[PDB]
Nucleic acid binder design. Sequence first.
DNA 1: CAGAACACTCTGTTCTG
DNA 2: CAGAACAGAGTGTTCTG
Lengths: 72, 72
Amino acid sequence: SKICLVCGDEASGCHYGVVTCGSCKVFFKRAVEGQHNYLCAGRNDCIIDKIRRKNCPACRLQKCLQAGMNLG
Amino acid sequence: SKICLVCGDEASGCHYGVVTCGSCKVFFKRAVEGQHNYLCAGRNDCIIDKIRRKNCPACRLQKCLQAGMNLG
DNA sequence: CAGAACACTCTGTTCTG
DNA sequence: CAGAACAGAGTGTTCTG
Ligand SMILES: [Zn+2]
Ligand SMILES: [Zn+2]
Ligand SMILES: [Zn+2]
Ligand SMILES: [Zn+2]
């Protein structure tokens, strides 16, 4: 496939176990080892797409997890 | 109140008609004047508080207008 | 492919008449 | 008070093993 399983932007290959775009790749790496205080403002099922992926990083991260992205 | 009617943060007085913090004051004018494409990732009722006011500018603008802000 | 180093978005603060 | 404008976190792209 050529679409990111997380946001639907054009995929640049398989990153951390899942086919993702470059911004989802580094969002995930940064989420896992960084210092964020993400919090959903809706009901933990925000729509994650290219247009809205910056809106709820907390749902973005959860969607990354469910798709199976991992470091290990 | 010292409280912002849009986001609950400590308010710096009445701006464009409504008691607001400084961030919402300048968020509101930037929104209205420079219209661009804000879209809710939930169901257009995102909680707007200090921790989460960057998440959904569409709802943030929506709460601003309801609360009564304007430039006229 | 994983990471680094860059550049961008947008926001929020401080300063002013 | 409204507005100018600098500084910042968070994000995204380009590049370099
Ligand atoms: Zn993506
Ligand atoms: Zn969410
Ligand atoms: Zn506010
Ligand atoms: Zn919303």
